[PDB]
Amino acid sequence: MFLQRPKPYSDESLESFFIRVANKNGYGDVHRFLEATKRFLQDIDHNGYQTFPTDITRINPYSAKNSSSARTASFLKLAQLTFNEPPELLGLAINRTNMKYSPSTSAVVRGAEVFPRSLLRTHSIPCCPLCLRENGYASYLWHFQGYEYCHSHNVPLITTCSCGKEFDYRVSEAACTVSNWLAGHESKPLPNLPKSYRWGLVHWWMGIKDDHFSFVQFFSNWPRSFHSIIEDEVEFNLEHAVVSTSELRLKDLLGRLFFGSIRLPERNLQHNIILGELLCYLENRLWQDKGLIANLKMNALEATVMLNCSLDQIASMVEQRILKPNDVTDYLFHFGDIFCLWLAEFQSDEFNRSFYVSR
Amino acid sequence: MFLQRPKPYSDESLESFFIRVANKNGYGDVHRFLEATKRFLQDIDHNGYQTFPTDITRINPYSAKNSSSARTASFLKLAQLTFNEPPELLGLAINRTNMKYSPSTSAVVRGAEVFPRSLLRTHSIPCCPLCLRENGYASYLWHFQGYEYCHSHNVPLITTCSCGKEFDYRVSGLKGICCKCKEPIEAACTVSNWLAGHESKPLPNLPKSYRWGLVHWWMGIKDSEFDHFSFVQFFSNWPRSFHSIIEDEVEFNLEHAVVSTSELRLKDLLGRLFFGSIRLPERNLQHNIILGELLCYLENRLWQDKGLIANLKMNALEATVMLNCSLDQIASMVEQRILKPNDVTDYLFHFGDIFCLWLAEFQSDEFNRSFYVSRW
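Structure tokens for the assembled complex are given below, as produced in the milestone run.
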């Protein structure tokens, strides 16, 4: 009862929140208060105390297969009746979600922001002193945020940083722009897209390349780079057609570019201008030849990623004679007819047409 | 066919554009242009030559029962061939959507704005004739209910004549004068002047695609037309009188509950407050704060009165309605034990169990709960 004066500010990965309430009043590590919490959960009016963790790690609410729904309920009354002025506690929890990306990477929600994959480091991370402490470490690329040359791996003697071995993970120029971009600033050479799309497209550059100087060369010519990468890869795989010479089926014509940039992770056309510009170069040139873009072979399974269906509306659309039959697994229909009924009967307010060119 | 384009306007309706391009190309009436356009689509052999309408009120893509794909594809061919400079016509078109409104109302989309279906006028549309007399082009706000007064001249929309023959601009042309007789034709003013995007009065401001859902929410609760006087009065005492009506209605069906104080469904404890404010048009509760404060009441009032709110019984398909999932994904929650139970229709789950479930498994970047941490 009555944890005196919850102080803190934003930008924290919730692990030092228990450390900052540990350094008050005189207490060793966090095993006592962490037992006295789960003892208080074992106390009055509670049902899910058995799975609240024991160690330095695992306070994370995705570390168990099925105590995810028990950890947030544990975290519900862990702020209200144990703090004077109950602080911003909920929302700091790095949860899991139902979302994915196109390269089949697991999405993960912190409070509004999505990391590329729930794999990144989880162990043996660098750390810098004189804050309390950070939000952004235990990740791939978040190093300095203004003050540089701070890696701090502890080859010399014990207790360099003055905290008390709580978080303290230590064992015995283009990088400054991207570090300020992932921490959140103005970043004048970059088009100011939010952190769900910031980390959402770092893996999109990591997925197609299989590198901070190779990072910023794609962003120094940002109104030219995506238009140049789409025009030199469309001439690839044209002499390798499958039927006779043309009318190429699925997976062979832009099967990597189109199936790698859709819903990463949210379907907004205001910020994710990749989806609007790939729609531009593919459909500023609608009918070039007989069977070049529109007159191709498409399937209804890869059509519901744009149409937003669950294979239940197709039994009421093709029998109502909107999409003319020219069947679930065959490359039957065409790209030009499926996209146009999407524009005619499957629009939205933010996932719509009136956000790309012309501005 | 070579056509000269008129001056573009962002607030011009779709039907009036075919009328004002029939005026500058020498037509007596506008239906003669629709017959010549169908002949032009027949010559170029584009797929819309079977179902191109020669009638003015069915030129919209939602009027076609099965040829909306043939309608907008012909809109793409006319935008790039018969004009010297391509105009913006897809923003002028009115296209359907799969996103529904509460409880079962469909919706339609024009440009970057989603309109309701129950407010769509299936009858004759009124007119402000002095806008047709000075400017000559009509507005797109006349196609849907709620927009009663003009936001530019503060004058009411005149529906019919003094004799009985109503005028509509879709037939005779937009000079504004009838066919048969052919004669010259604060709260309501409040709800007029923050529809076209005007950000000046303390009535609440939304991206006005979401605002029509706020108009549609007012008609579903009151079960009448979109009232204007109490609409200003309800938002003048915002958000103080909102939570009182929430409190007086959860007191209502609990004082007059039929079964008991427990073993109840969430009907007759949240009957119309929960099922009538879900999808307007999306649950992004920073925008539609009618769900951001409803799900604020669902957070701060969980575990009082010996779990009176945490013993509301639910079935399986309410998770498909609320939490945006399917019935097959619920069976994955049972086999790998993330959801713990205690068939689709049978009532088996619990409320404090399901509220802490979607903060851990069913929270997207758009559908967050952190968006109102500074409101309560």
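Chain B touches chain A through 55 residues (CB under 8 Å). The two ends of chain B are 62 Å apart (CA to CA). Further analysis is deferred to the final report.
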